[PDB]
Amino acid sequence: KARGNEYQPSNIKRKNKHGWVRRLSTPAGVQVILRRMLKGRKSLSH
Amino acid sequence: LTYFSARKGKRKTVKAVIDRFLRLHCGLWVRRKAGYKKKLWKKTPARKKRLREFVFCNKTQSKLLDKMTTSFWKRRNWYVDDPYQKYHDRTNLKV
Amino acid sequence: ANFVSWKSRTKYTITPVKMRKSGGRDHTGRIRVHGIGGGHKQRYRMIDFLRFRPEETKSGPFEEKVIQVRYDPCRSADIALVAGGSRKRWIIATENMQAGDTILNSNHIGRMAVAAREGDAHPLGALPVGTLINNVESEPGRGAQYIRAAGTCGVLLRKVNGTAIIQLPSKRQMQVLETCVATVGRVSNVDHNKRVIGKAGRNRWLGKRPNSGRWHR
Amino acid sequence: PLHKYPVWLWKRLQLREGICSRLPGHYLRSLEEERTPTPVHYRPHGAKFKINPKNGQRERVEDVPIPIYFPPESQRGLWGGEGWILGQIYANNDKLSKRLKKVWKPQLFEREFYSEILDKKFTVTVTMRTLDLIDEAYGLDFYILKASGEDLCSKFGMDLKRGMLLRLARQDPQLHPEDPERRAAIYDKYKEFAIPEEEAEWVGLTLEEAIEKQRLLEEKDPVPLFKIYVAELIQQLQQQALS
RNA sequence: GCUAAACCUAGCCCCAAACCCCCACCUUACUACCAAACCUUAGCCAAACCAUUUACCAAAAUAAAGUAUAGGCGAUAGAAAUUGACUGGCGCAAUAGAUAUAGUACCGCAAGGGAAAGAUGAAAAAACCAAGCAUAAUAUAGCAAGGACUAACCCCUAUACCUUCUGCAUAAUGAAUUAACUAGAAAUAACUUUGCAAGGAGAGCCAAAGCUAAGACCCCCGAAACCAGACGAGCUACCUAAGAACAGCUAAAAGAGCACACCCGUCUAUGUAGCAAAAUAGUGGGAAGAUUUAUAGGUAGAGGCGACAAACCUA
RNA sequence: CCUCCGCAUAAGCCUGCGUCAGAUACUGACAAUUAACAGCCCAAUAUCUACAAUCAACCAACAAGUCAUUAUUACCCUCACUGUCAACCCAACACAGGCAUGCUCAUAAGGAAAGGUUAAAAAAAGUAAAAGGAACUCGGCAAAUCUUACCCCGCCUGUUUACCAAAAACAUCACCUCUAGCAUCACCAGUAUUAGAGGCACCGCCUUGGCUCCACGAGGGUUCAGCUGUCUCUUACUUUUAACCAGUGAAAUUGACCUGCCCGUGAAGAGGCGGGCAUAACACAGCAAGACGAGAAGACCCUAUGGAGCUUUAAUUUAUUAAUGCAAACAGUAACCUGCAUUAAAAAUUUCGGUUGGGGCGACCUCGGAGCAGAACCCAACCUCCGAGCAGUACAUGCUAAGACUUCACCAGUCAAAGCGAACCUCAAUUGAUCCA
Ligand SMILES: [Mg+2]
Ligand SMILES: [Mg+2]
Ligand SMILES: [Mg+2]
Ligand SMILES: [Mg+2]
Ligand SMILES: [Mg+2]
Ligand SMILES: [Mg+2]
Ligand SMILES: [Mg+2]
Ligand SMILES: [Mg+2]
Ligand SMILES: [Mg+2]
Ligand SMILES: [Mg+2]
Ligand SMILES: [Mg+2]
Ligand SMILES: [Mg+2]
Ligand SMILES: [Mg+2]
Ligand SMILES: [Mg+2]
Ligand SMILES: [Mg+2]
Ligand SMILES: [Mg+2]
Ligand SMILES: [Mg+2]
Ligand SMILES: [Mg+2]
Ligand SMILES: [Mg+2]
Ligand SMILES: [Mg+2]
Ligand SMILES: [Mg+2]
Ligand SMILES: [Mg+2]
Ligand SMILES: [Mg+2]
Ligand SMILES: [Mg+2]
Ligand SMILES: [Mg+2]
Ligand SMILES: [Mg+2]
Ligand SMILES: [Mg+2]
Ligand SMILES: [Mg+2]
Ligand SMILES: [Mg+2]
Ligand SMILES: [Mg+2]
Ligand SMILES: [Mg+2]
Ligand SMILES: [Mg+2]
Ligand SMILES: [Mg+2]
Ligand SMILES: [Mg+2]
Ligand SMILES: [Mg+2]
Ligand SMILES: [Mg+2]
């Protein structure tokens, strides 16, 4: 049907999927944070 | 042909050329005849001798081999007992 | 995935345990077995399969009284809640044990083949030759793993000096030690295999969905 | 820009500036030494020069070592310098054919060893090369005391080494008394590998353990300035009483 | 005469030197307080295919030397022994120089992508011209001009440019127009001009007039791909856990009938830069089930998942 | 005059139409949502719990089900923290869409289809229509009034290509066949009446089945009846659109244009070229013949030593797994791990020549004699014809070396005096480089 809205927000899913705790759990996520830190990003995670 | 190596920045020789041809110092290159030791049973004696000769190369073949080697192979070498020391220089070549 | 298996319970409880479905999926989270998912929600009755398990600081052959024969959703037979001594437990009920019968669990190897009823359980030395038995264990004490499905009965064909030969319901033969315990008689829910499933709905209630791409190749 | 120092030299700069500088001298000597192992999976050229074939001229030969791979189970045991060879191979011993991955592993045993210096039976994961090196060393105690750090190539093996070396350096009551003549026999049998205790405590450590051991040495819960200043004042008043 | 146009320092680039950095916060980070690291890169790419092979990257001046050596002995690859190693700018100047006024605003679920722009001056406690228009619409006839003419038109001549083509006015491509920015990088050997000359060159090299030095010569944009490592199952597929919904009539526990709520999407009509990157309006199919549905969780890329449609896995 | 609307919670937003001041729901300043609702829980050791729910009462099942504490030990200090606004969220937008649950069943709540005219066409929607009643059409599509029967397929209810296919396809009960004798991370807390895999299609009778065979279908056709603007053949009105006035105000497109018709010509279909003819200049509304109109570097066809698949009885490999064998590491008595081989499986890498009156099919691919090509040399063909991939004789069928020829390049090919050594080659093509071996 009308296919604009794949973003159905919930803060539990947002925090569980892209959060700081999850980023820091994986060693590849620690490198994601390290990359945002080097880029200079004002927000490193959700 | 590797005009600029990744290692030195220098120009490289084609060792296929060095395996096959002889550069005499005057700019002449001397080769063998392609086929000179195969099927000699079925070749005739005159064709066999024509195959046995050492021949000179063409002008554009000479210039190609000039390009495909470096100038180490174009210096003047004074080997002890050399069968080509008389051939390394041009005599009476008017024009 | 975060797959703790639901079967973490240690003490033998008689009450049903809330049984988690799996969808045919590993701990890795991926499908391992195809065609599984979404049955009626069930509960697991913890069956004691060691038929001769005498209770705490007690003796050999003992008696139990059947309390209730019951449908079990987690298998094909019927489960008998039986009570003996100060404890009670579930067992697989052979056919024609109602509520009120009395069954015997003996480890005694009588020299003569014991004249025993259809419900009770003895070792194959006490069982006669050519005898219909169901809950059969390979080594003594491990607990029965063989014939215990609905309506199946394996026969005892012969007795040998230290072993015995069982015809398993697949027309198979199996060597068992003489001393292991086995229950006589055929299991309940006979006519079970002559139940037509009827609707794809009935299959989907049993917990088997249609699944395609069964060969992840 | 450019770094003042090269990046392969950054580690030495740390070892000169830190608490790594307050590590003792002999330990940093070993860490900087880091020599070459013994040939295990390659056959060394016996000579420095060789008349190579196809032209009778002597070319210099160096023997280059195979990049061997050691797993943490190896460090939990003892493998005699022997490890996995992770390489490629040609399909049918013919270069004009497929090239294809290959991992050569050693054969691993669970052997039980008595060490006369510690008086304990250890069960370890050895291989035939360790067994043969023990036979040519005339015992496990001699093998571990004689073999070098990287030829031994085990964190466990060097723990065994510094336990044995500390045992020797302190001359401990190792089995128990009523056999001091037998203990004297043991320490006389291995008397040759005797080093100071201040060295044997640092034998065999990793750098992480060495830094941890060093900061444990220099913790030193602070001195109250009440104590410091009353010491100064007492000194000054004794000076005034003298004058 | 409007719109504009103009500006110069904010900074940046390449070198040299010198080795540099109170509280809260891994739980849903920024939240006062409870029982485990270590495993060959692969592949694009050259070989005008590709299958052994294919530079360097994993600290190493000049020369030896692109030599020995390796090699579908081919593309190419390639040593060693030995040997002489105080700050500046023929840099940018706001589309440049950094992406930077900022990793911000904005975009994306996320990894991630990623901007733009300011100019009065000593003190503000003080002038002209791009395009586009306007002042000022047009008068037969035609690549818009040219020859001219007393005179704008009238007369005569006259098939836009680029590119690609055997041949384009072509009804072949490109292009509204303006400003700015935007595309020829080097060796072997020659030749020319100096220096010196049987020797040249500030050694490691050449030399049967040579040798040394200089000068001259090698473009830009564009795939579908491939491999590695991350990020994604808030959409959708399936599953798990604990929830909920299903009027009325007929019927009397049936994947029941008619039919709402809801779910779907048969036919038509509208719509098409739309209300909408799939909607609307009527018509329709299911609507107590193999149903629909909220919330949380799981499966991840040659992988998942599938009641197979090469379907779906954030248009 | 309108409305499956409205109010509330949940989820999501995060101050987003409160007051004042200012400029042209914007900007700034100032205010505000007050816990009783809701959230943030539980001191444990051992242990107890066979009994559904459905008005739960008879009674009815099958698919077999959620609600539960005790003996003792320690524990009186008491009510903090946080959410609380709105016209709101997800769709780039103040978006006709998406959006869970409770309650109201037309509202007590919420809202406004028309900026103002006029009343052309074309277009949209609606209503009415004489006579006739499917003559329309691919077809009764749409409308109008409701209905009948027959076939084809699929047994059924279900599922499917989100966004052109909802079907005869997929699934499904039923049946067959194949594999499996067993324990704890799937199958499974299972055990041959079980589990896993594949296939066919319900059923009554009989043994790639076959003949019947009932019900169902937004499937595919056919018939009757009615009904109707589908049509003969169109019409009238009303609403939107429209046109005009006012405000706001895009987009594709565009070499430049001072932008006519006819006949001819020309890269073969001319506004612009030749010959004629026409010809004051500017709007507005229509229209759709042309501008080979716009859109989107044609998806059809071919090409590329471009890419990706897909299958194999294509090439190369078994590195990985498997089951053997051989050693290696133990127990002996007169299994598991490692190394080397093999055959399988899964794969994994890689490629898929050329000419061709498009490409494919078919045929050819090197060399020589003849004709086209008549008299130096040359001269094409998917042009016309004929042949070869050797055979003989001896084995000077040695060795050297002036000078030449040359298949239009190179590679290759050919002749040859003299000289030394000697007996005293025939040949129409009659073939193949380099590296390796
Ligand atoms: Mg290539
Ligand atoms: Mg800039
Ligand atoms: Mg920029
Ligand atoms: Mg102007
Ligand atoms: Mg053309
Ligand atoms: Mg073209
Ligand atoms: Mg254009
Ligand atoms: Mg310009
Ligand atoms: Mg989900
Ligand atoms: Mg129904
Ligand atoms: Mg249809
Ligand atoms: Mg599905
Ligand atoms: Mg298909
Ligand atoms: Mg298909
Ligand atoms: Mg949108
Ligand atoms: Mg109201
Ligand atoms: Mg209006
Ligand atoms: Mg009528
Ligand atoms: Mg007709
Ligand atoms: Mg008709
Ligand atoms: Mg209709
Ligand atoms: Mg059907
Ligand atoms: Mg579709
Ligand atoms: Mg759908
Ligand atoms: Mg459809
Ligand atoms: Mg249907
Ligand atoms: Mg207007
Ligand atoms: Mg014409
Ligand atoms: Mg034109
Ligand atoms: Mg067109
Ligand atoms: Mg094209
Ligand atoms: Mg080509
Ligand atoms: Mg490729
Ligand atoms: Mg691929
Ligand atoms: Mg072709
Ligand atoms: Mg020639």
UniProtKB/Swiss-Prot annotation, chain A:
- Is Repeat one of the keywords? no
Protein name (record): Large ribosomal subunit protein bL34m
**Alphabetical UniProt keywords:** Mitochondrion, Phosphoprotein, Ribonucleoprotein, Ribosomal protein, Transit peptide
Q: Which GO terms describe its molecular function?
A: structural constituent of ribosome
**Location of Phosphoserine modifications:** S25
Q: Which Gene Ontology cellular component annotation is one that this UniProt entry carries?
A: mitochondrial inner membrane
> Which GO BP terms sit in this record?
mitochondrial translation; translation
Domain of life, per lineage: Eukaryota
- Segment of the intact protein contained: 47 to 92 of 92
Cell location: Mitochondrion
Q: Which family does it belong to?
A: Belongs to the bacterial ribosomal protein bL34 family.
Q: Which organism does this record belong to?
A: Homo sapiens
Keyword DNA damage attached: no
Q: How does it assemble?
A: Component of the mitochondrial large ribosomal subunit (mt-LSU). Mature mammalian 55S mitochondrial ribosomes consist of a small (28S) and a large (39S) subunit. The 28S small subunit contains a 12S ribosomal RNA (12S mt-rRNA) and 30 different proteins. The 39S large subunit contains a 16S rRNA (16S mt-rRNA), a copy of mitochondrial valine transfer RNA (mt-tRNA(Val)), which plays an integral structural role, and 52 different proteins.
From Swiss-Prot, chain B:
UniProt-recorded Gene Ontology molecular function terms: structural constituent of ribosome
Where located?
Mitochondrion
> A GO biological process this protein is involved in?
mitochondrial translation
**Keywords carried by this UniProt record:** Mitochondrion, Ribonucleoprotein, Ribosomal protein, Transit peptide
Top-rank taxon = Eukaryota
Would you tell me the Gene Ontology cellular component terms? mitochondrial inner membrane; mitochondrial large ribosomal subunit; mitochondrial ribosome; mitochondrion
Family from the record:
Belongs to the bacterial ribosomal protein bL35 family.
Q: How does it assemble?
A: Component of the mitochondrial large ribosomal subunit (mt-LSU). Mature mammalian 55S mitochondrial ribosomes consist of a small (28S) and a large (39S) subunit. The 28S small subunit contains a 12S ribosomal RNA (12S mt-rRNA) and 30 different proteins. The 39S large subunit contains a 16S rRNA (16S mt-rRNA), a copy of mitochondrial valine transfer RNA (mt-tRNA(Val)), which plays an integral structural role, and 52 different proteins.
List the protein's name: Large ribosomal subunit protein bL35m
- Origin species, per record, is Homo sapiens (Human)
Curated annotation (Swiss-Prot), chain C:
Q: Name one GO cellular component term.
A: nucleoplasm
Q: Does the entry feature the keyword Amino-acid biosynthesis, yes or no? A: no
> Which sequence ranges are marked TM in the entry?
none
Main subcellular location of this protein, as a coarse class: mitochondrion
Give the domain of life: Eukaryota
Annotated localization: Mitochondrion
Q: Where is this region: Disordered?
A: 204-217
Q: Could you give a single Gene Ontology term from the biological process aspect?
A: mitochondrial translation
Which is one GO molecular function term here?
Answer: structural constituent of ribosome
Q: Does the keyword Transit peptide apply?
A: yes
Q: Which UniProt keywords apply?
A: Mitochondrion, Ribonucleoprotein, Ribosomal protein, Transit peptide
Q: What does the sequence similarity comment in the record state about its family? A: Belongs to the universal ribosomal protein uL2 family.
* SUBUNIT field: Component of the mitochondrial large ribosomal subunit (mt-LSU). Mature mammalian 55S mitochondrial ribosomes consist of a small (28S) and a large (39S) subunit. The 28S small subunit contains a 12S ribosomal RNA (12S mt-rRNA) and 30 different proteins. The 39S large subunit contains a 16S rRNA (16S mt-rRNA), a copy of mitochondrial valine transfer RNA (mt-tRNA(Val)), which plays an integral structural role, and 52 different proteins.
Report what the protein is called. Large ribosomal subunit protein uL2m
Origin species, per record, is: Homo sapiens (Human)
Give me the gene this protein comes from: MRPL2
Which region of the full protein is contained in this chain? 61 to 277 of 305
Swiss-Prot record, chain D:
Broad class of the protein's primary localization: mitochondrion
Q: Select a single GO molecular function from the record's annotations and give it.
A: RNA binding
Q: Name one GO biological process term.
A: translation
Tissue localization of expression is: Found in a variety of normal tissues including spleen, testes, thymus, liver, kidney, brain, adrenal, lung and retinal tissue.
Q: Which Pfam families match?
A: Ribosomal_L28 (PF00830)
Once renumbered to this chain, the transit peptide range reads 1-54
Q: Where in the cell is it found?
A: Mitochondrion
A single Gene Ontology CC term: mitochondrial large ribosomal subunit
Q: Which UniProt keywords apply?
A: Mitochondrion, Ribonucleoprotein, Ribosomal protein, Transit peptide
UniProt superkingdom:
Eukaryota
> What does the similarity note say?
Belongs to the bacterial ribosomal protein bL28 family.
Q: How does it assemble?
A: Component of the mitochondrial large ribosomal subunit (mt-LSU). Mature mammalian 55S mitochondrial ribosomes consist of a small (28S) and a large (39S) subunit. The 28S small subunit contains a 12S ribosomal RNA (12S mt-rRNA) and 30 different proteins. The 39S large subunit contains a 16S rRNA (16S mt-rRNA), a copy of mitochondrial valine transfer RNA (mt-tRNA(Val)), which plays an integral structural role, and 52 different proteins. Interacts with OXA1L.
Its UniProt miscellaneous note says: Potentially represents an important therapeutic reagent for HLA-A24 patients. This antigen is recognized by tumor-infiltrating lymphocyte (TIL) 1290 in the context of HLA-A24.
Q: What is this protein called?
A: Large ribosomal subunit protein bL28m
Source species of the chain? Homo sapiens
Lineage of source species: Eukaryota, Metazoa, Chordata, Craniata, Vertebrata
Q: Which gene encodes it?
A: MRPL28
